[PDB]
Amino acid sequence: SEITLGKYLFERLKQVNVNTVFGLPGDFNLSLLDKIYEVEGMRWAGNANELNAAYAADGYARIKGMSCIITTFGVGELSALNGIAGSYAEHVGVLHVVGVPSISAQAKQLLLHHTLGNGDFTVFHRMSANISETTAMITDIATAPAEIDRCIRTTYVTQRPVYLGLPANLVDLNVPAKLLQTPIDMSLKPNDAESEKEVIDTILVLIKDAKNPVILADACCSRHDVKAETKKLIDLTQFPAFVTPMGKGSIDEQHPRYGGVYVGTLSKPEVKEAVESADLILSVGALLSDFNTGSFSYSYKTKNIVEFHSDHMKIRNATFPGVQMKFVLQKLLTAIADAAKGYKPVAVPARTPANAAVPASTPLKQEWMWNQLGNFLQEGDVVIAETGTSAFGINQTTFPNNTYGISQVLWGSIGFTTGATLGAAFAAEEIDPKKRVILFIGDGSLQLTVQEISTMIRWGLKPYLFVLNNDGYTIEKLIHGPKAQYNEIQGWDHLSLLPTFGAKDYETHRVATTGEWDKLTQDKSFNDNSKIRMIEVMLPVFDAPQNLVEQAKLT
Template identity: 65%
Template sequence: MSEITLGRYIFERLHQLKIDTIFGLPGDFNLSLLDKIYEIEGMRWAGNANELNAGYAADGYARVKGISAVVSTFGVGELSLTNAIAGSFAEHCAVLNIVGLPSVNAQAKQLLLHHTLGNGDFTVFHRMFKNISQTSAFIADINTAPQEIDRCIRDAYIYQRPVYVGLPSNLVDLLVPSSLLETPIELSLKPNDPEAQEEVIETVEKLIKEAHNPIILVDACASRHNCKREVAKLVDITQFPVFTTPMGKSGINESHPRFGGVYVGSLSRPDVKAFVENADLVLSIGALLSDFNTGSFSYGYKTKNVVEFHSDYTKIRQATFPGVQMKEALNKLLETVENAVGPNYIPAPVPQQKLINSPAAPDALLTQEYLWTKVSSWFKEGDIIITETGTSAFGIVQSRFPNNTIGISQVLWGSIGYTVGATCGAAMAAQEIDPSKRVVLFVGDGSLQLTVQEISTLCKWECNNTYLYVLNNDGYTIERLIHGQNAGYNDIQPWNNLQLLPLFNAKDYECIRVATVGELNELFANPAFAVPDKIRMIEVMLARMDAPANLVAQAKLSERTNAQM
């Protein structure tokens, strides 16, 4: 074919990047566009339950494969996506947000169409998305449309942020040269300024040479911006102790002998807190220093020797180097850092995590403390582990991830219900990579009720690699801890959660309820349970106010912050 439709062009570009699942919902302004998905062998239309869930799913897929795409329709569809897209923007996830628009002629004539505000303004929703998008294209000219699409895909991937592409319904069937597909989209980073980078490397190496107690602290953007390999090499070469933040969990192999644990400011384990805060040099990689990620900003470094490597700049003490991107800077540092580690540095033993504090009787009721330490023994290499905002996101800090784990949470944006949609996206991505890769969700009974419909999509696509742990603690425990322990607004209508898989017409499934230590131990010891051959829901019964200790402490800090004038 010498020419292809513009609609097919955009999906062929995504297919070149191994993006083979497209999320979203149909609407009359995108139907012709959706036809083009079925023209590409190996590409599928997820067909989500609603746009919000589709956005969450696209976010989860992007965290596994590096970029994703979601399609909605003008106005009513795209506005339902805003919460999900804002979360992807905040947490650095590359989502191509494709919106089917009314035709160019309809826009020019300012027709009083459905899904509009009735004022002839067809750009109002595009303007809303500009605040939560890295870039955008409101396409009106078929001649420049392929270049605009390529630009948006590139920016999404490079900056790991959502981009907005508006496609008028009359343009998607117009033809463009297929030869344009022969030139791959340029996805390499712009080179750092050589002089600025040289100054960064020289200064960092000087600080390393003088350090007695240096540490490496890994945060979320190390994973989002594809720097996990660089982090691992830096630890191996220097033998510096390495810690993660809650959002950075899975950014380093936690079985590495130099891994010391998770640092959350004042909410850290005492030995971790003391070790990190007594460092005389902190190499921070990919930091996103939000309140829940830092124990309400309670970092207590005793040194000013802090180096921050970010995706688009580097900061050393009070000096900022705009444009010195961490990917290239870290690779440059790795070339010579071995020679920079001075005689002052003698590797000291790092804190060791004790996974089970004490044995519990088989008939003892389950607690968060026991669950989050015991589950570490059941995790296996390659798992994708997803934890909902609330008790799960805080409890997972106590667990240990195996190597090559992908950890997904939304600690910064913190939209409850996010993880059910994200699990759908992650599970479909895992199917494309390796069907034996397990996807493990931990979600509270309250959060589940916001986005439960996406379990239907998991069932539709037979995502039998999925484990859905529903922590039933009778409502919004995280909110009860912050304020209103017995308030009615923190209650939920109880559901028969184990009826959800048959309700959504799952084919191969298993439903299990555990309430005691013995039941959980027996489940984790069962080899058949560890095999991802069916979709499983495990309802974990917990006391209403039982919560991880660090969440209890964080809730007190949050309540105090909320009450401040």
């Protein structure tokens, strides 16, 4: 028996659990799109924007493991680029598949629509090359499947965007259906014995001489299939554990040895004192390490630190290529037992005290809210916070045990969260329908990717959208141009947005005073993901969380 390349792709995707595809129909991808509808349990998001789709695909990847978006030749693929760049930058596995024109034996003299007009049809591919781990422009079905498998394996394995160009005339050719019986190998090859070894010797050597160690969970410790290894390291050692604004969400904040969020100079004096006073640092999932001109001053001089990355090791200045943090962390876990035996637990910074009762009419303030949010969250919630005050605000909330956070800290492209809510809420519906997805986004950013709420309504998703109305680009005004016109926006009837896009079963709320917040977030019918909800929080123009108003002065 045979199966058409078009159907084989989706089949493979279903096998790797990417049950939702993102994008918009168009040139050279219409026939390919018929196929997805042929595979059981596959659905087509039906986005309203190649960008929003690229964003959604990122949120989906972050939650489900990896994702896939299909755009059209030229006009489609170029629109999604920024969303691709972001996924390339923050290590997100996204398979970008574009429907390419038919592959002919002679000059495609007649191809013009959606082209630069200069005859060069490889330009859009060459462009995506810069923000892609690898690219594959298929030409003969003799190995098309092997090539699909490869782009899928590479994406998942290395968690970075992969470009897959597929000519239209091939989506309908047949390939051996048999090929589908051997799953794709999604495993990493074991490390070079002699190096992983060397790496260990050294780390124990370091752990032994160290007197005040501290663990630091970072960006790449969340979606790199290394959650266990990390929970084990914390237990077996019992050293003080801290997260980075990018690592927040990947560590159980209700753990007895959790110190907090290390954001350098924006850290809590106690938190800052702890991390900097350590004589050894075990940074898991390393990717940030230094930030000077922007955000904070978290950079120092790398004082004797070990950096576990997905593919390499970094002890001081020496680098060990190929040595993958997973299998290392494992081999390093067996021997960590003895060397830590007589360790004296170093006191860890206490939790921030909850806000103490205040009259129900006091107007809402960000600092109060980011600290109050901790009471609404519940185990299992996926929280998403947009660049700007929100991004900063979420770093000051104590996460109930087991909560996934999404903050595009390194790339920082506003708008991105709207798309992500769809992709995330999507995956979430797929894993556990009772998993909630809360989103905090400022008024300024909603405008850039606003129409994506339409796609939320059409699928009957039930996410919580908190909109922060501080009338403008506060975060900007704080670093420059407080009253700058380019920092102000057009006023929008935020709430009515839902029904405008067709929301038939929704709820809209407007919180202005502490009282109003508690009553709502405490309602038992509100705590339940029964339907889409837009909650508009009214906040001051120059009100901002503490951590931000501090770096706002120097940067």
